[PDB]
């Protein structure tokens, strides 16, 4: 029902990187979220049955060629659930002549690997009164200048208790979730009629992948459960916004592809996931694509915002 939330930015030398540890302590449990921009933006989610679990970070090992074991939650015997979510690629499709709801949504351009981005230092963004921080980035190699005045931002917010923000999309949170907002702002598309998207990968349980469980889109709710509750989950509305003020008229559909079992080798390499889990090959990946071929788009103001919740336990009953 309520949790005491601590947030720390954890730094090292050499080769400083953005690492954010959110620790939400209940009466007999802790939820740990470890967010990082070392490699593609990733979060490691760990649920423990003690109010005293701790995160250990070995920075030199985390930055080495074999980082397995560099991140740990201790004691290991207290871990009830652990998994990860990785944002691997920023996708772009030319939708000229495509139909709404097509798969793929358009003719794909070469995706931007989010492992090849550089990021601002998150220390400055950390806002302890709002329990938030953000990771803002752009490609390291941008020969076309597409991000000369553009960035992709991942804003993370934790919660101490249940509530429903006033700002659209007004997802109901509990103390068992973080909210993530992803915003693409001011980057140049590579042609007209571009639809943007994100490739998302989760760490699966066994060989096979869960399905998305599904009123205008602003009152709809999609949910992905890692396993039967209590367990990891993500929830979002199938809407994104193409204007910063998120006027209803700026709403765009957010379509999710089916989840595909995916090998590590088909995704950008994550040192964070490998540090916590060792070498693993059971990922589940899907593409989220924003917008239709006509109507509002990223093309209006070069703005796209999408929000989701990520949590452990029972999902918020958002009804």
């Amino acid at each position, epitope marked *: 029902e309520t949790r005491q939330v601590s947030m720390e930015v954890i730094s090292g030398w050499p080769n400083p990187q953005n690492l954010l540890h959110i620790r939400a302590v209940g009466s007999n449990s802790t939820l740990h979220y470890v967010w990082s921009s070392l490699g593609p933006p990733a979060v490691v989610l760990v649920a423990t049955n003690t109010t005293q679990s701790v995160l250990s970070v070995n920075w030199s090992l985390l930055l*080495s*060629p*074999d980082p*397995a074991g560099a991140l740990m939650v201790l004691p290991k015997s207290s871990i009830q659930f652990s998994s990860a979510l990785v944002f691997t690629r920023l996708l772009e499709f030319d939708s000229t002549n495509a139909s709404e709801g097509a798969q793929p949504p358009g003719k794909p351009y070469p995706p931007y690997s989010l492992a090849k981005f550089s990021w601002n230092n998150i220390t400055n963004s950390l806002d302890l009164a709002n329990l938030s921080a953000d990771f803002q980035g752009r490609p390291v190699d941008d020969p076309t200048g597409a991000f000369a005045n553009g960035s992709l931002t991942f804003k993370v917010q934790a919660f101490s208790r249940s509530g429903r923000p006033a700002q659209p999309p007004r997802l109901l949170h509990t103390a068992d979730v973080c909210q993530l907002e992803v915003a693409l702002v001011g980057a140049s598309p590579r042609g007209n009629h571009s639809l943007f998207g994100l490739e998302v990968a989760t760490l699966g349980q*066994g*060989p*096979d992948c869960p399905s998305v469980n599904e009123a205008p889109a602003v009152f709809q709710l999609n949910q992905l459960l890692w396993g039967s509750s209590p367990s990891g989950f993500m929830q979002w509305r199938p809407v994104a916004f193409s204007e910063e003020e998120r006027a209803r008229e700026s709403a765009l559909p957010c379509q999710a592809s089916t989840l595909h*079992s995916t*090998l*590590a*080798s*088909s995704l950008p*390499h994550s040192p964070i996931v*490998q540090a916590f*889990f*060792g*070498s*693993q*090959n*059971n990922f589940c990946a899907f593409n989220l694509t924003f917008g239709a071929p006509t109507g509002p788009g990223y093309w209006d103001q070069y703005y796209l915002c999408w929000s989701m919740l990520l949590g452990m336990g029972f999902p918020p009953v958002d009804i």
Partner: antibody
Amino acid sequence: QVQLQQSGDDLVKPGASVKLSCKASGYTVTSYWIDWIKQRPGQGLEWIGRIAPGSSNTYYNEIFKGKATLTVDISSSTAYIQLSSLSSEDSAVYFCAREITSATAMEYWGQGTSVTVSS
Amino acid sequence: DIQMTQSPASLSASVGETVTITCRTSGDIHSYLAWYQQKQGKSPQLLVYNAKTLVDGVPSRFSGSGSVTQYTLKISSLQPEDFGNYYCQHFWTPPWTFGGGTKVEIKR
């Protein structure tokens, strides 16, 4: 307790097909991938492919696409490989193996089934 | 694909000696690499996975290490029962091929 029990050694005619089986027991069959591996007499190991028993999702080595077809019967916890259009190069021992949880090794192996292609 | 070169193809050593088998890959495989031993007339048995993790029950004289493109199996204090064929296998981009093998012979 984890066991993979493979079908008996076989003689098969050139150009016919043969279906080999591997019955898994001692664990929940849908929680792990199953792979097939080929070994010609005196030679090294060749990876054929893998199958996820819950979904029948497969990966194949391109060398065996159209030679080999993987299937599973979940109710009987049995993996099958069908080898079609057989020739002498197909004479070999075929192993089934279960992947480890992380899907980054083959931990439990069956005993192998020898196939000889001859008239 | 990933190309793998396992070397040497054969080695001969005496009981009590320490020997090494190397597997070099064409690209970084991030420790997605296993080692097997195969004895005459038997199935292969997994010795080490994820480059360096020893399987429970496997004698501690076997060890693996490596990263990036260079992986090594070490057998300390070689015993007569170590005779046989050894194979690396990667689990990076499919196909998940095997090294060409190393035959270990025992001098006596």
